[PDB]
Amino acid sequence: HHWGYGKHNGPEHWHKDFPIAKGERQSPVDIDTHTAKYDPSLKPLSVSYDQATSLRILNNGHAFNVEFDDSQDKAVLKGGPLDGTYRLIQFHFHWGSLDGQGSEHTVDKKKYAAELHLVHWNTKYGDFGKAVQQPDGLAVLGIFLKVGSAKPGLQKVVDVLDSIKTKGKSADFTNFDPRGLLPESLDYWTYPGSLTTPPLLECVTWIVLKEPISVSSEQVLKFRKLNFNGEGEPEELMVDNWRPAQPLKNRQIKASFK
Ligand SMILES: NS(=O)(=O)c1ccc2c(c1)S(=O)(=O)NC2=O
Numbered sequence: 001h002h003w004g005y006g007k008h009n010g011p012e013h014w015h016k017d018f019p020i021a022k023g024e025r026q027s028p029v030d031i032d033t034h035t036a037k038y039d040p041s042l043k044p045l046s047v048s049y050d051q052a053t054s055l056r057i058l059n060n061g062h063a064f065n066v067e068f069d070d071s072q073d074k075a076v077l078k079g080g081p082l083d084g085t086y087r088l089i090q091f092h093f094h095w096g097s098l099d100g101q102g103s104e105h106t107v108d109k110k111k112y113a114a115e116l117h118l119v120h121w122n123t124k125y126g127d128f129g130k131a132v133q134q135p136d137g138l139a140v141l142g143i144f145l146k147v148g149s150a151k152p153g154l155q156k157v158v159d160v161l162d163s164i165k166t167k168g169k170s171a172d173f174t175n176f177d178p179r180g181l182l183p184e185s186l187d188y189w190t191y192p193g194s195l196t197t198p199p200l201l202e203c204v205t206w207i208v209l210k211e212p213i214s215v216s217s218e219q220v221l222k223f224r225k226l227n228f229n230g231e232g233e234p235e236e237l238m239v240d241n242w243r244p245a246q247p248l249k250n251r252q253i254k255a256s257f258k
């Protein structure tokens, strides 16, 4: 009886195995744009993905991850609310069964069709494993996806999904450039939070971009063909793999723009 997104193992059940689910800095959260405040202390955000080297794509039964080689300082995120350098290790998405839902964070309660998470770990901790034991160990760059024109840069990901349909399947995925998934503007909201799936660790500095990228109905439809189940098992379409907004509690969301 593993955690998941269904009626009997979904988000409302996670707290039993992971009590931190009811913690003080859980994610995602609704971003109230009127309550968010411009923060002058935020430094310019730097997203340097020029030397990023992707390696493989994997269906882990919850979503699909595009993993990168993070043994050298290559694809890094810095600036903004961050102290130091954070290294890109993987990116994945959360999406819905319909275009009207799918994102984890919401903006004034608005849900987007999907949300892209580019996960980075703080290099001061030596490796990802040590980073997830720290309160400032991770930084996740979140980008909303809305349905409209296709995103050319996402098609290569869309086309390889047929090869990793079920849980446990992976495929070589080299030379993918994540710069093709970024919107024009880097304006963002930031707050301290957690991983949005078990183990729900509170080690994340969230940086959520205000400008969403547009993807086509056809591209998101292909996300919905993936399976939560493993090969040979009853088919459970991989849809609505998102966690709803959690209590903001004692936190303030800061904006990088006026
Ligand atoms: N959805 S997310 O908060 O980016 C996230 C959720 C789970 C995990 C991550 C990110 S991780 O740091 O790559 N390892 C995980 O288990």
Ligand SMILES: [Zn+2]
Binding pocket: 092, 093, 094, 117, 196
């Ligand atoms: Zn995620």
